[PDB]
From a paper:
Compound 23 is bound to the active site of the CRD in a very similar manner as lactose and LacNAc. Residues His158, Asn160, Arg162, Asn174, Trp181 and Glu184 are involved in direct contacts, and residues Arg144, Asp148 and Glu165 make contact through waters. There is very good electron density for the sulfate and the two sugar moieties, while the nitro-phenyl substituent at O1′ does not show nearly any electron density. This is reflected on the B factor distribution of the molecule 23 that shows the galactopyranose moiety firmly anchored to the active site with an average B factor of 17.42 Å2. The sulfate group shows a higher average B factor of 32.77 Å2, reflecting no direct contact with the protein. Finally, the nitro-phenyl substituent does not have any contact with protein residues and shows a very high B factor average of 178.97 Å2. The sulfate group contacts the protein through water molecules; one oxygen interacts with one water (S1) that is in contact with Trp181, and a second oxygen contacts two waters (S2 and S3) that are in contact with Asp148. One structure makes a water (S10)-mediated contact with this latter residue. In our structure we can observe a direct contact between the oxygen of the N-acetyl group and Glu184 (dashed line in Figure 3c). Interestingly, the nature of the aglycon had little influence on the overall affinities within the Lac and LacNAc series, an observation also corroborated by the X-ray data which showed the aglycon protruding outside the active CRD-binding pocket of hGal-3.
Residue numbers in the entry: 113 to 250
The structure:
Amino acid sequence: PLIVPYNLPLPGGVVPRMLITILGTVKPNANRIALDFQRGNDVAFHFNPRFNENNRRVIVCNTKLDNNWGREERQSVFPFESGKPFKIQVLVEPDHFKVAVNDAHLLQYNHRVKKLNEISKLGISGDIDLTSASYTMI
Ligand SMILES: CC(=O)N[C@H]1[C@H](Oc2ccc([N+](=O)[O-])cc2)O[C@H](CO)[C@@H](O[C@@H]2O[C@H](CO)[C@H](O)[C@H](OS(=O)(=O)O)[C@H]2O)[C@@H]1O
């Protein structure tokens, strides 16, 4: 098991055909989960399941440049459940990150940060027990 918040270095940045797999279990009464793909202080891709935003569950995705959040992309399909194990797979494609949860496609996020090889860390945080976090080339 891994300590949260957890930093996964991505040596040499991300590249198309890179697949990141995260296994964990959502804590009971969870509030939030966050994946943060970072380019230095910037957040290239923030993937943020929210379990109670005005009594709705929503996934918020965004980019942070020079400390400023951009336009949010919101997904109301919500595959996470308090107390239950999950698998997140993030596949880097030429034009987007492609996210599947529990083997089902969830969303795509078009690349706003264009220097993919400078996106050199993934931060994993929030109300989870983290079982594994790894990458492979497919
Ligand atoms: C419905 C909605 O849009 N809510 C956003 C709200 O928007 C409005 C705020 C005020 C007014 N007003 O006053 O009328 C109108 C809109 O602004 C918040 C601050 O930007 C957003 O929260 C941030 O969202 C980020 C991702 O985008 C990160 O997740 C971040 O968390 S962090 O720890 O990583 O750094 C988190 O704070 C909210 O999602």
